[PDB]
């Protein structure tokens, strides 16, 4: 560990980063158990992102301006 890390703001940032990882661990265990199979909403979100990227690439003659 660098001596930059031993300050009070770095302690505060590590505390909130521990809080964010705890919340993310709760979300991961919450969406491992969903129906029909694990990870069913995540793949819907990736469907939506790929579809709008295909639209934005068709609008710019596949140059992505």
């Amino acid at each position: 560990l660098q001596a930059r890390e031993l300050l009070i703001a770095a302690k505060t940032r590590r505390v909130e980063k521990i809080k964010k990882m705890q919340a993310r661990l709760d979300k991961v265990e919450q969406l491992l158990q969903e129906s029909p199979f694990p990870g069913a909403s995540v793949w819907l979100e990736e469907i939506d992102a790929v579809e709008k990227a295909i639209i934005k690439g068709r609008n710019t003659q596949w140059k992505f301006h």
């Binding site: 069913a40 596949w62 140059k63 992505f64």
Partner: protein
């Protein structure tokens, strides 16, 4: 025509890069060898080797050895010859005019002094030649060891089997991989690639070995060629002809493909211990045992290289190009040239082939025009990348044009946190690229393609985007009112939701008649000037190829006078001119059915969307589907399990 043009093109006395033996065609002519190499760099190696005058006092030299080039890949004669039956009850074997005029084979016939109407059964006939044996110094990679050596054997079998009986066709035997241990003074030599892969997977610490791949034989250093030419006669082999060999030479190189489909499902039979000891001890090779290992391993390799995988939709080369492009443009998305990016993806992805084919693959992976192969390309192309009109064959040279990573499409379709959890390919020990990508969408049915291969054909026509989105949202989403119906249809192999061809960027029209779709272009007629204006061609029809095809049919040239192209860069506009009073002759002469018009029958304005859905599967091997629904239903569980493990 030859005599008109012989004052500039006189008799080429190169005989295809032939080097004379000091004793070729004399009293000791049967003491002589002919080291037929594959190119010119190979001849550089062989001429370096045959001149070690006192570093190799027990070696060969040019007193009894010649050289000649095989010119790349040999033509086969089994598909270019006809057995014709005469009156007396004998089938004579008459060749083709294309096979007769092949410059490479003319060279070796003039060098060896062969005769086509001889049979060489007696030794009085087998001493009228100019050399004693042909010796094929070819590469040890699977292309040169299998393909052109099998075609050379097939040529000599198809015309003179008695010389394969009596020991006339020979070959060297070189390493393909050498591995150098730190400290010790002897390397480990592997002759096949899968032998080295099974070896290198067994190890636990390969941190101090240096694996050397020898692509062609001209990559061999000076101490290596000295140690290979001190043991020259130690490593020449000879072919022996079996009685079961005629069926194998008819399967692999005959004009019937279904024998080759029926064979090439199962993998290569491993080689036994008695056969191994017999080959390495008595130093002879049966032709059938060669055709069922080397030629079959080559043909399976060519299916792997030339046919896509049904998960990601891309071949082996395009998968290396995508992996090297994600690795290269990581820091900033700064442009590179084509040859510089090709050098990068040949260095870091362990590509073991030529550079011209890799650069052509990068160019055609970057192209985007109405009717190109890729509807969703990996790269953004910057420069001149060709047009509809010459079919994309009018791009720039690779020193001019540039590519760039289409970063957000590559990020969304192929997520980065998924690529840590895929099976990879190892070349020479290190990771290079995945076995496959598993995209968010079934990209193998979303684009085009038309290739030949060994045994099989590949041809696809892309589907609508909205149909595929509706299918995957019916599978995944539980609040979609076509969820359990589609699950029942997956259980019982029936269809519910439509799956139409892709009409995007196409302004003609599609019609389903019986069991296939047809695509139709658009004309526009005017009898006041005898002008038909073509405003649309069918799917994937080049413009100048269409116009030159309509000019060769003299049945159609008797009705038109002048044809003028007014096309745009991406829009078709073709203008014909008719000689007066010929529309009614077209209507009564080119008849109209209810599937195609008379004007479309006249102007070649429809084609069939005919598919050949033949892919490769994971862990190797062909798989052949019947409809696109089968490909989608095979695709879905891989993506499901990949989400679970991430």
């Amino acid at each position: 025509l030859q005599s008109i043009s012989k004052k500039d093109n006189h008799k080429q006395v190169d005989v295809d890069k032939y080097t004379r033996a000091r004793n070729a065609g004399g009293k000791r002519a049967q003491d002589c060898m002919l080291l037929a190499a594959e190119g010119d760099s190979a001849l550089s190696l062989l001429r370096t080797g045959l001149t070690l005058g006192k570093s190799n006092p027990s070696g060969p030299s040019f007193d009894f050895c010649g050289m000649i080039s095989l010119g790349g890949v040999i033509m086969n004669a089994c598909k270019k010859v006809t057995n014709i039956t005469t009156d007396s009850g004998e089938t004579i074997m008459v060749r083709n005019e294309q096979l007769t005029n092949n410059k490479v084979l003319q060279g070796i016939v003039q060098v060896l002094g062969l005769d086509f109407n001889c049979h060489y059964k007696t030794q009085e006939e087998r001493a009228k030649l100019r050399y004693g044996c042909i010796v094929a110094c070819v590469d040890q990679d699977l292309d040169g060891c299998g393909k052109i050596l099998g075609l050379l054997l097939a040529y000599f079998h198809l015309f003179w089997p008695q010389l394969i009986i009596h020991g006339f066709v020979k070959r060297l035997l070189t390493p393909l991989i050498r591995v150098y241990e730190k400290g010790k003074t002897m390397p480990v030599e592997f002759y096949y690639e899968q032998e080295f892969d099974a070896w290198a997977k067994k190890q636990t610490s390969l941190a101090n070995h240096t694996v050397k791949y020898y692509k062609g034989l001209a990559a061999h250093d000076t101490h290596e060629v000295k140690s290979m030419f001190k043991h020259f006669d130690n490593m020449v082999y000879t072919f022996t002809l079996d009685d079961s060999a005629k069926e194998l030479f008819h399967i692999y190189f005959g004009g019937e493909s279904e024998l080759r489909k029926r064979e090439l499902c199962t993998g290569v039979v491993p080689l036994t211990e008695t056969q191994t000891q017999s080959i390495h001890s008595v130093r002879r090779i049966p032709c059938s045992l060669h055709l069922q290992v080397d030629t079959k391993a080559y043909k399976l390799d060519a299916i792997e290289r030339q046919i896509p995988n049904f998960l990601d939709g891309m071949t082996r080369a395009r998968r290396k190009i995508l992996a090297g492009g994600v690795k290269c443009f990581a820091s900033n998305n700064r442009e590179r040239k084509v040859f510089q990016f090709g050098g990068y993806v040949a260095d870091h992805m362990f590509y073991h082939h030529g550079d011209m084919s890799l650069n052509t693959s990068i160019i055609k992976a970057a192209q985007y025009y109405p009717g190109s192969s890729h509807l969703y390309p990996v790269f953004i192309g910057i420069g001149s990348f060709g047009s509809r009109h010459l079919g994309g064959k009018d791009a720039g040279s690779p020193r001019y044009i540039s590519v760039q990573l289409a970063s957000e499409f590559i990020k969304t379709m192929f997520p980065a946190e998924d690529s840590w959890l895929l099976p990879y390919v190892f070349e020479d020990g290190q990771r290079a690229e995945p076995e496959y990508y598993v995209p968010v969408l079934p990209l193998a049915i979303m684009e085009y393609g038309a290739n030949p291969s060994e045994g099989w054909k590949y041809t696809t026509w892309a589907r609508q985007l909205e149909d595929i989105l509706a299918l995957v949202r019916a599978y995944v989403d539980k609040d979609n009112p076509k969820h359990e119906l589609l699950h029942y249809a997956i259980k019982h192999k029936i269809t519910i939701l439509p799956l139409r061809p892709s009409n995007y960027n196409f302004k003609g029209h599609l019609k389903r008649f019986g069991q296939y779709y047809y695509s139709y272009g658009t004309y526009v007629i005017s009898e006041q000037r005898n002008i038909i204006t073509i405003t649309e061609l069918p799917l994937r029809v080049p413009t100048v190829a269409y116009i030159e095809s309509i000019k060769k049919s003299s049945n159609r040239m008797t009705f038109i006078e002048e044809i003028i192209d007014y096309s745009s860069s991406e829009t078709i506009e073709i203008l014909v001119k008719l000689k007066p009073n010929s529309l009614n002759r077209i209507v009564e002469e080119f008849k109209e059915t209810e599937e195609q018009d008379s004007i479309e029958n006249f102007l070649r304005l429809r084609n069939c969307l005919h598919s050949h859905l033949n892919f490769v599967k994971p862990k190797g091997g062909i798989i052949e589907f019947n409809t696109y629904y089968e490909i989608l239903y095979a695709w879905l569980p891989y993506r499901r399990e990949l989400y679970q493990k991430r």
